[PDB]
């Protein structure tokens, strides 16, 4: 096993409600939460997973806790509606992981972005060299629609790592009909 | 061998919780555990009196 | 519904709270009057009292 803390960053914006990505996009990101919580059950249960959004608020309803059955109950009535702010999402998740219990856990975090965010590349490079001085690899999986080939988050992937800490893997969004498990099959292959 | 003159410092939130707890369960005796800081031999302090659950039988 | 006027209720000493419901309000002397022994006098032991 391995000691880390992955903060699932769901999108509750008003773009995640249609059915281009499979029979609900809510169900698409919900199956994503299913596979990451089962994956951290298959990982070390000493690790912890908590919920957070980037849109409409920074909503903490569960603590970053090693249980996730209550998170599976928190899957329901997510009601995705609001306006995206992922640039506060990185920092709010990072302070949530500076509110942890142990330092031997690593910090490999995922993120789900599904809307056009007003994110300057200077904003996310402040965040990115901040994470260079905060030791966090982030594996973002693009959902929804902002661009068919995301660039700002590609720039964050570029500006997070160098030569040793290349733990930034960006599944850009396939904005046409692509499956529910074919999106998350590549990070469960390689995060 | 030899033992220095001991002292029990309080924090008076201790005494206030004692009176409030014995006021809350007032027709009955209660039991509790005292929290503080082991400073040295000649003094000791209670910094915190926290609630302890009821019994009913004994 | 269980409580009619004049009931034996099992109450704690400390809390003074009703906890049980007792079934009997009797004397043990009345209990000693009860007949369990069942002697044996069949009517053939009685003669001429028809």
């Amino acid at each position: 096993m391995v000691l880390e803390s992955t903060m699932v960053c769901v999108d509750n914006s008003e773009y995640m409600r249609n059915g281009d990505f499979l029979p609900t996009r809510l169900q698409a990101q919900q199956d994503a939460v299913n596979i990451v919580c089962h994956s951290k059950t298959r990982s070390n249960p000493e690790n912890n997973v908590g919920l957070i959004t980037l849109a409409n608020d920074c909503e903490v309803l569960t603590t970053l806790t090693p249980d996730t059955g209550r998170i599976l109950s928190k899957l329901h009535t997510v009601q995705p509606k609001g306006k995206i702010t992922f640039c506060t999402g990185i920092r709010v998740a990072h302070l949530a992981l500076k509110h942890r219990q142990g330092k031997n856990h690593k910090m490999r975090i995922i993120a789900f972005v599904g809307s056009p965010v007003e994110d300057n590349e200077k904003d996310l490079v402040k965040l990115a060299k901040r994470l260079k001085k905060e030791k966090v690899n982030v594996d973002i999986i693009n959902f929804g629609e902002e661009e068919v080939n995301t660039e700002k988050l590609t720039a964050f992937v570029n500006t997070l790592n160098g030569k040793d800490g290349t733990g930034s893997h960006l599944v850009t969004v396939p904005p046409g009909p692509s499956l529910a498990d074919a999106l998350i099959s590549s990070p469960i292959l390689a995060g | 061998a030899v033992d220095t003159a001991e002292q029990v410092y309080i924090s008076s939130l201790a005494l206030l919780k004692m009176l409030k707890h014995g006021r809350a369960g007032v027709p009955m005796e209660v039991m509790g555990l005292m929290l503080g800081e082991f400073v040295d031999d000649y003094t000791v302090r209670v910094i915190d009196v926290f609630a302890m659950p009821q019994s009913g039988t004994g | 519904e269980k409580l009619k006027p004049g009931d034996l209720v099992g109450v704690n000493k400390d809390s003074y709270l009703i906890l049980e419901t007792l079934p009997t309000e009797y004397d043990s002397r009345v209990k000693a009057m009860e007949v369990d022994e069942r002697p044996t006098e069949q009517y053939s032991d009685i003669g001429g009292l028809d």
């Binding site: - | 009821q54 019994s55 009913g56 039988t57 | 009619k4 704690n12 906890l19």
Partner: protein
Amino acid sequence: RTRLLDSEIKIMKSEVLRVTHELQAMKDKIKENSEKIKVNKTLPYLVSNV
């Protein structure tokens, strides 16, 4: 057969609701049984008249 599979996953959601029933039943029940342990095991009971 899409609605049949939707109801099949909804059967698992209703099993999660049964697990929520199991949690809010067993946990709350055993906590209130523990309070009834604290209150009801006080076996000397003063009896009285209502």
